[PDB]
Design a protein around this ligand. Structure first.
Ligand SMILES: *C[C@@H](*)[C@H]1/C(=C/c2[nH]c(/C=C3N=C(/C=C4\NC(=O)C(CC)=C4C)C(C)=C\3CCC(=O)O)c(CCC(=O)O)c2C)NC(=O)[C@@H]1C
Ligand SMILES: *C[C@@H](*)[C@H]1/C(=C/c2[nH]c(/C=C3N=C(/C=C4\NC(=O)C(CC)=C4C)C(C)=C\3CCC(=O)O)c(CCC(=O)O)c2C)NC(=O)[C@@H]1C
Ligand SMILES: *[C@H](C)[C@H]1/C(=C/c2[nH]c(/C=C3N=C(/C=C4\NC(=O)C(CC)=C4C)C(C)=C\3CCC(=O)O)c(CCC(=O)O)c2C)NC(=O)[C@@H]1C
Ligand SMILES: *[C@H](C)[C@H]1/C(=C/c2[nH]c(/C=C3N=C(/C=C4\NC(=O)C(CC)=C4C)C(C)=C\3CCC(=O)O)c(CCC(=O)O)c2C)NC(=O)[C@@H]1C
Ligand SMILES: *[C@H](C)[C@H]1/C(=C/c2[nH]c(/C=C3N=C(/C=C4\NC(=O)C(CC)=C4C)C(C)=C\3CCC(=O)O)c(CCC(=O)O)c2C)NC(=O)[C@@H]1C
Ligand SMILES: *[C@H](C)[C@H]1/C(=C/c2[nH]c(/C=C3N=C(/C=C4\NC(=O)C(CC)=C4C)C(C)=C\3CCC(=O)O)c(CCC(=O)O)c2C)NC(=O)[C@@H]1C
Ligand SMILES: *[C@H](C)[C@H]1/C(=C/c2[nH]c(/C=C3N=C(/C=C4\NC(=O)C(CC)=C4C)C(C)=C\3CCC(=O)O)c(CCC(=O)O)c2C)NC(=O)[C@@H]1C
Ligand SMILES: *[C@H](C)[C@H]1/C(=C/c2[nH]c(/C=C3N=C(/C=C4\NC(=O)C(CC)=C4C)C(C)=C\3CCC(=O)O)c(CCC(=O)O)c2C)NC(=O)[C@@H]1C
Ligand SMILES: CCC1=C(C)/C(=C/C2=NC(=C\c3[nH]c(/C=C4\NC(=O)[C@H](C)[C@H]4CC)c(C)c3CCC(=O)O)/C(CCC(=O)O)=C2C)NC1=O
Lengths: 240, 68, 161, 160, 161, 160, 161, 160, 160, 161
């Protein structure tokens, strides 16, 4: 108990409220807990738009575990249990049940089709599904709607006009200045990667290999290298 | 900052989708220069056909002013 | 898209006029045939599979299409062809219920001709299948909605051709 | 309309309407005569409602008719009354159509950008719409009053 | 997008030439007018919304465009037209700062003409609005940067026309 | 500030600072003494500037001090003057910092939402900021007047 | 993050106080040393890889870390250790430019210790490498910015320890 | 240039230029004459700088001109001197531009791939550029020498 | 149910409920007594329905109750009738809820895997469900018969 | 902990070297200044309460810190702040006597920034108080030991900030 005991011997010992020795002696005789491959404070709170990331200085509750490199995390399927993708290699392509979240797919034409209707026709009915998809894209990428000045125009304009598809609009949102300002600037580097992974792809990271692939890109190209590498994965094209 | 005007047709053979895949199979879209490689390779590996490609944003031989 | 009511409403919107007697009798003309449209749509929905099967038997299968080298050859291509058949039938039902082919123009016909040209699908054979669907549907629904059903099938065939 | 919404939902789901949409349609149709009657009543009383709503709005917001106001002057007041007439026509369209698609497309999407560019008090637009709601509800029976007040309340909420 | 200096650099690099007296003179000609561009750009940024309001009042509104049947009719179309207006103003300011209409060609004019043609937008009305911002901005900025501001608005109007 | 903006831009690309950023930092550190002098000059006369800008704004837009106005009442006028003093302090902070980074987070992002919730005229607040700019530039030399006026119409453009 | 100027501005904004003589003196104290920080940052940016190479030679390599059983053994771990070293150098340069370790707190030290505990990395060896880069940078920059550079390396070492 | 970097950020935020950005552009246009003088001096002393850097570089590490060296041969060394001239031209371009974007678009992006394919020593090229830095600094005043040295050691860091 | 579907859609869109969604909620709450009456009828006639479904099922597919059959033996037929009772219960739940959500969560998702593991004829179970549909529709009025037949048909289709 | 002599001896032991002329010259420099540090430490020990006296009166009290809502509000927090300030003074005295910051790093600086972040203590106010006692100590000790005392207070302030 070298590391645990020398934390207790320090004069910051009373500032730690989470018990450490009973947890440590229990960890020695049990399998690996499931958390981030890095420290246990590296996985953010799973709320709509928080990105909490407990500080490890405001109130130390540091918890480590030798995770290695080939340990593949166990994730719960937010939907039908038999589509976990670990016992069903093609599970994201079979149906969509009521057990999971609503899936937005811009099947409406968009395109600015026009018609054999009035030249300056007032109603035109459904162009509120493009508007419905636009406000839903923010709800996924940022977790909430932005303020008035922060909304990215001249990409929603292209999406409405049909010049670009949803995959290109999502790329414009993810590579935006506001997304970097919110979820890249004020966070530790490996925390920002883990949170951005959940926003751009619907799941947390699986492996130390998966985390390191984005880490060694962030150290060479920065935020744009991470976001571009995430959006250009085979998994994104296969699933979404 | 260059873009690409790309028209492509992607047929999905083994899936058989139940509802409205005109907008997914055949489409024209704008793509940035730095992502045209990945987008083209995505189209090729799915058996799609790249009907047309246009520059639409840049100049043919710019040494400068083409920064991302 | 639009329906009859929305078409009248926006046609008066473009002039900035309140609803007048002319829009009134167009709306009444749409309203008076509501029940027949509903009954024919219910019949078509209940007999959707049989109509497609009969149309395919009458116009497509037992030909060079189902043989090797035919566009309808192989299970994948045949299932795709019958899915297109179901597409045409369902969107014809929607257009008939709404009383306007704008939904057919927007969600069906746009780009379909060029897509079929690129894929190699036979447009003439598809039009023949659509017409077989129209004959079977006119037989099933009866005189009350036969013309109302057939007009949108003719619209689809004209747009494809 | 209700038909348009049901059709677009069934198309997006890729299925037929089933008894569900079938009967809801056989009804969005039974109430047609009552909706037409309410629309006809509002159209006949269009002038009185607009004038009374403008008068009541200028009582709660006297500053709009004032030197530093959007609607200062006879012609700017006429423009405000024309706007109120436009919204009354849109409410009649919504009543006849059975939903709020025409209202939302015609005069809601971008109305904020409208009145921000024009330097117009949108809360005063909302107060004018409320005045039109009260005046219109004063001319209708209880059920039809509630039916029209639903659309007026939707307009008031969406203009926020 | 390129500035005057970047354009000169690319023009000399494509021929593989170092900077000579002519390129230095061109760079000096750009440098001598830098401050006036910054001042006029600051004034335009400060008075952006008033310029658009006055231009719309002088060119578009109080006509059939804002009336029923008009292209700018309805809040959605009015909002879109004013957004296009402010886009034109902002990119005109960028082009005037950079001393080069390359950004105007690259990020506004590409696709705008056929987009307007497909949507039915009045090109003549748009050109009039851009000109209205032209004399409004010329009045605001003053003699120093009036012509330099006006050349890029004329560039936008000529590209649209 | 300038340092924060340059460092954040470099960090986004994951690279050390470019020569242009170093040059702009040197220009900023050279102009720092003048910037702090201008800030102290504005701070010494904060009450006179606020009072004169308030009287100018109320003369320009009397409707806000009208019965139906947002700033009706002694307390309401006091709150408007306090907001003007807030924006003057923000302008001094921006002048010393050399960039708009701190004042941007302090008082412009979400300002539209707060003023819409408070039902206030944003163009009226902008006119008040312009009056404060005029009163402030009346107390400064020409170059320093332009330097302060840059941040002033930055606030004016932001509240739009 | 925050620099000295932003820190003073926030400390006065939380009190809602205009800038006074003490704040002006603090800002002047930062201003008088601006140029030396820029010069030192340019020096480290120019000689980045040499600093890492000398630090590794002085403190890490030619030991049991690079032999079998060491944490720096194998090409993967060697690359990881040098990339960590580069991260420390770059963020030390940022902190030295900004005059405030808040960036080091926010983006490096937060959770680094617990990550190293999870991975098994030797914190003592990491501290030794950080100090080695410290003396190398102190030798390169000179007396003018030696202490100013050294304070942030000491801050990183104390945060890790 | 500085204008390009500022305008890219302004377009990314969809907003006009910030007051710090206008101040930076003003300072850059003020420094333009000095930058032009420095570029003119380097362009005039081009060939002498290249020659001295060339015979300086082969003394620190003569192995590159050895039998197992990349630059072994008269034409091989002529190519190396041509590369040094190319980088001097790029430095002169960047000095006038005020930033490193045109230098990056021409000689830095994907520079570690072509040199890896040619199997040339990138650290050797860095020392070669450093020699050019000393030779150029020897012909300039102290302030301009530091100004050119900024771009030179920027290139040295870039090839690294 | 319909409320869960509408609220889920509105929440996922981050919006208040649309008037069309409110109208469908009103229709669902209006039809509540009729749906409850249909559920009461089916629940009271549950045992006869299951027995007759078993009789026509064993008549139509006698191989199922045969020596190499999944449900040969008195307890194996008891389990088959118990499964039929389970599906009738889920159909009543679906009728009361107004949609197919309870049926999908409780007895359709994974039914293919479960019945493949148990080695039971899924087409045989579908035929049993159809027999239950016939027996149930023979005990109801026309509108109620169609309303229950919709859920029975969905069950048969989903078991495919 | 370590001091000048122990640091030098261990630095030569780790190499395996005899104490050469440079090491003896560093011990020259340490030993020649010895009595000044001793008298400075005696003065600080004799005037410890008054140094905290003026430091608090000049940096902390009569501000928002002592009023309600402040951190140093209430008798408990006031006593804790003065005890901390005395801790800093005493450990600075130890560092000045030893001629090394190792004791300050080992027993004060570690856990301090994290503890203050946990409890909400204003680090800027703490640095101001440390600078206050630095000024007071410089006034008391005089020319002989002013810089030698002030260097460790500056080290503590830089480590905290
Ligand atoms: C053992 C025979 C079983 C049987 C079969 C049956 N098939 C048909 C008709 C068709 N079968 C096909 C099949 C294919 N098309 C393909 O591309 C492939 C992949 C190579 C296959 C397998 C087709 C296309 C038809 C339609 C006619 C045609 O070929 O043109 C029929 C006739 C049905 C009818 O309604 O006429 C039968 C009876 N029936 C049994 O009972 C056997 C188990
Ligand atoms: C020239 C005055 C204009 C005006 C203003 C007005 N403001 C309020 C109320 C508030 N204003 C604020 C402002 C801020 N909070 C911040 O953090 C900042 C950034 C520094 C600002 C600017 C707040 C918080 C309030 C609420 C009250 C409070 O401060 O606790 C009001 C009162 C509105 C009400 O409903 O009571 C007014 C009138 N009104 C005008 O007409 C002028 C244009
Ligand atoms: C079966 C004998 C027992 C039982 C199991 C049960 N499990 C779940 C759900 C999940 N089971 C897993 C398991 C794993 N994922 C992995 O990667 C691994 C390592 C190979 C395992 C073991 C997971 C992750 C889930 C949840 C996510 C998913 O479905 O994929 C359920 C369903 C729970 C529910 O209804 O939500 C059940 C029933 N239940 C018993 O009674 C048996 C004793
Ligand atoms: C059937 C009567 C004829 C026929 C058809 C056929 N179609 C395809 C493939 C496609 N059909 C579609 C159709 C649509 N996509 C949409 O978005 C919509 C809106 C409702 C429609 C109508 C498209 C785009 C495809 C390609 C992608 C896909 O397969 O889903 C095929 C298969 C072609 C292939 O092998 O790639 C066939 C055979 N064939 C005949 O012989 C009939 C005349
Ligand atoms: C305004 C002066 C005139 C006018 C305009 C109008 N425009 C649209 C629609 C669009 N306008 C754009 C514009 C741009 N996209 C870009 O990228 C840029 C530069 C960065 C510009 C200027 C586009 C792409 C569209 C299509 C998408 C959209 O509608 O937002 C409309 C709407 C047409 C409609 O209702 O469908 C209008 C009305 N109309 C006038 O009357 C003015 C003369
Ligand atoms: C190098 C001098 C020492 C050393 C280091 C070492 N590190 C790793 C692995 C990682 N290092 C990091 C570091 C960071 N993440 C951050 O966000 C920051 C702040 C910018 C840092 C510094 C991380 C996240 C990893 C994990 C990478 C992964 O997931 O694979 C290793 C590799 C360990 C392994 O098991 O492969 C090593 C060796 N080792 C020494 O001996 C030096 C003292
Ligand atoms: C008054 C009857 C006696 C007296 C008092 C006196 N007090 C001060 C200064 C301070 N007193 C306090 C007190 C408190 N802080 C707390 O948190 C609490 C608990 C609620 C108390 C009581 C403080 C903090 C100060 C310092 C200044 C400040 O508040 O910021 C003085 C001034 C001392 C000086 O200026 O040196 C005096 C004189 N004096 C008498 O003669 C009475 C017996
Ligand atoms: C005083 C100028 C500032 C201030 C301080 C403050 N500190 C505490 C509490 C503690 N301070 C310590 C400090 C140390 N313990 C050590 O061993 C060392 C080094 C040898 C130090 C520096 C500790 C451990 C505590 C917590 C336990 C305790 O209270 O003794 C407080 C009290 C906080 C509370 O009420 O919980 C305060 C107020 N506050 C200010 O405002 C000044 C800037
Ligand atoms: C059917 C959709 C639709 C609407 C609504 C519409 C409105 C509309 N309102 C206008 C003006 C105006 N609208 C208002 C409104 C108000 N002032 C106040 O104090 C209140 C907040 C509010 C009244 C309750 C004012 C003051 C003006 C004049 C603005 C000006 O002259 O600058 C104008 C500009 C002049 C013109 O009509 O040509 C339009 C187009 N146009 C459309 O196509």
């Amino acid at each position: 108990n070298w590391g645990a005991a020398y934390d207790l011997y320090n004069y910051a010992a009373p500032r730690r409220k989470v018990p450490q020795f009973i947890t440590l002696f229990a960890d020695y005789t049990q399998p690996l807990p499931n958390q981030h491959p890095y420290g246990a404070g590296n996985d953010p709170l799973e709320i709509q738009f928080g990105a909490i990331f407990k500080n490890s200085t405001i109130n130390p509750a540091e918890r480590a575990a030798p995770i290695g490199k080939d340990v593949k995390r166990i994730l719960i399927r937010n939907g039908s249990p038999t589509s976990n993708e670990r016992g069903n290699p093609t599970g994201m392509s079979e149906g969509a049940t009521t057990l999971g979240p609503k899936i937005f797919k811009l099947t409406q034409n968009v395109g600015f089709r026009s018609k054999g209707m009035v030249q300056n026709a007032g109603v035109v009915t459904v162009e509120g599904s493009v508007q419905a998809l636009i406000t839903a894209a923010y709800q996924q990428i940022f977790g909430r709607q932005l303020y008035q000045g922060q909304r990215l125009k001249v990409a929603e304009i292209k999406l409405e006009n049909g010049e670009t598809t949803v995959k290109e609009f999502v790329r414009a949102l993810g590579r935006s200045e506001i997304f970097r300002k919110l979820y890249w600037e004020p966070f530790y580097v490996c925390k920002a990667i883990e949170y951005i992974h959940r926003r751009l792809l619907g799941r947390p990271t699986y492996d130390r290999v998966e985390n390191n692939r984005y880490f060694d890109i962030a150290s060479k190209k920065g935020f744009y290298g991470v976001v571009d590498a995430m959006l250009n994965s085979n998994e994104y094209q296969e699933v979404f | 900052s260059r873009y690409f005007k790309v028209t492509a047709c992607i047929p999905s053979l083994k899936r058989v989708r139940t509802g409205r895949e005109l907008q997914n199979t055949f489409f024209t879209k704008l793509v940035p220069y730095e992502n045209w490689f990945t987008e083209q390779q995505r189209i090729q590996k799915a058996g799609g056909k790249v009907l047309s490609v246009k520059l639409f944003t840049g100049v043919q031989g710019a040494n400068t002013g083409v920064g991302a | 898209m639009q329906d009859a009511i929305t078409a009248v409403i926006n046609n008066y919107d473009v002039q900035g006029k309140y609803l007048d007697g002319a829009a009134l009798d167009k709306l009444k003309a749409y309203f008076t045939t509501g029940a027949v449209r509903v009954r024919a749509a219910a019949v078509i929905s209940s007999n959707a599979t049989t109509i497609i099967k009969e149309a395919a038997a009458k116009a497509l299968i037992y030909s060079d299409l189902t043989r090797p080298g035919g566009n309808m050859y192989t299970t994948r291509r045949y299932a795709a062809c019958i899915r297109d058949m179901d597409y045409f039938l369902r969107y014809a039902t929607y257009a008939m219920l709404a009383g306007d082919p704008s939904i057919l123009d927007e969600r069906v016909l746009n780009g379909l001709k060029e897509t079929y040209n690129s894929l190699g699908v036979p447009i003439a054979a598809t039009v023949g299948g659509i017409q077989a669907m129209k004959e079977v549907v006119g037989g099933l629904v009866g005189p009350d909605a036969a013309k109302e059903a057939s007009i949108y099938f003719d619209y689809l065939s004209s747009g494809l051709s | 309309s209700v038909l348009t919404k049901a059709i677009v939902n069934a198309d997006a789901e890729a299925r037929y309407l089933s008894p569900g949409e079938l009967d809801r349609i056989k009804s969005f149709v039974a109430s047609g005569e009552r909706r037409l009657r309410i629309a006809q009543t509002l159209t006949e009383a269009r002038e009185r409602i607009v004038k009374q709503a403008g008068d009541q709005l200028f009582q709660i917001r006297p500053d709009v008719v004032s030197p530093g106001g959007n609607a200062y002057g006879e012609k700017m007041t006429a423009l405000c009354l024309r706007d109120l007439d436009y919204y009354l026509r849109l409410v009649t369209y919504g009543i006849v159509a059975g939903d709020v698609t025409p209202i939302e497309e015609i005069g809601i999407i971008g109305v904020k950008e409208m009145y921000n560019s024009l330097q117009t008090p949108i809360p005063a637009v909302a107060e004018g719409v409320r005045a039109m709601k009260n005046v219109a509800t004063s001319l209708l029976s209880g059920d039809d009053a509630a039916e029209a007040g639903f659309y007026f309340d939707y307009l008031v909420g969406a203009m926020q």
